[PDB]
């Protein structure tokens, strides 16, 4: 999330201050963290269940 705000939005933040900027940026990290963390809850709930 530090690099999501450090992305293109960063160079824009001190000027744009846009809601549509952190939206697509936090949406950017979203798809990223779920990709792995979705398979973590799996190996745990289906691992510590037995």
């Amino acid at each position: 999330l530090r690099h999501a705000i450090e992305a293109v939005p960063s160079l824009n933040n001190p000027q744009t201050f846009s809601e549509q900027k952190l939206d697509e940026a936090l949406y950017h990290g979203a798809v990223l963290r779920v990709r792995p963390k979705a398979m973590t809850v799996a190996v745990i709930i289906a691992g510590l269940l037995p």
Binding site: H3, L32, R35, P36, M39, T40, V43, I44, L48
Partner: protein
């Protein structure tokens, strides 16, 4: 031994997906016509860039947090204690070895 394995698997898929999604984002840029045989050496560093600080240190918490239970002990430390010191030093080298 059934707990650590559950706290090891988490990061054990982190330095995997961060790399699998770091490659699909490279294979998505360059022209697929002619390829090279160096990619499997830069995908290393790519995953290393922002997973080393994250995971290594993050699971470097599971130790100092698993220590409190280790500090109190007359029987409980041989109980839930050995289960603490294990996954830690493991992660330390087994994360760079996992990322390898």
């Amino acid at each position: 031994i059934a707990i650590a394995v559950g706290a090891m698997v988490d990061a054990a898929i982190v330095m995997i997906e961060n790399a699998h999604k770091r490659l699909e984002e490279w294979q998505h840029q360059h022209p697929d016509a002619t390829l090279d045989n160096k990619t499997r050496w830069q995908v290393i560093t790519d995953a290393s860039v922002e997973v080393g600080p994250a995971l290594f240190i993050s699971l470097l918490i599971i130790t100092l947090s698993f220590i409190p239970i280790f500090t109190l002990e007359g029987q409980e430390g041989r109980l839930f204690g050995p289960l603490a010191f294990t996954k830690t030093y493991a992660m330390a080298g087994a994360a760079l070895l996992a990322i390898v």
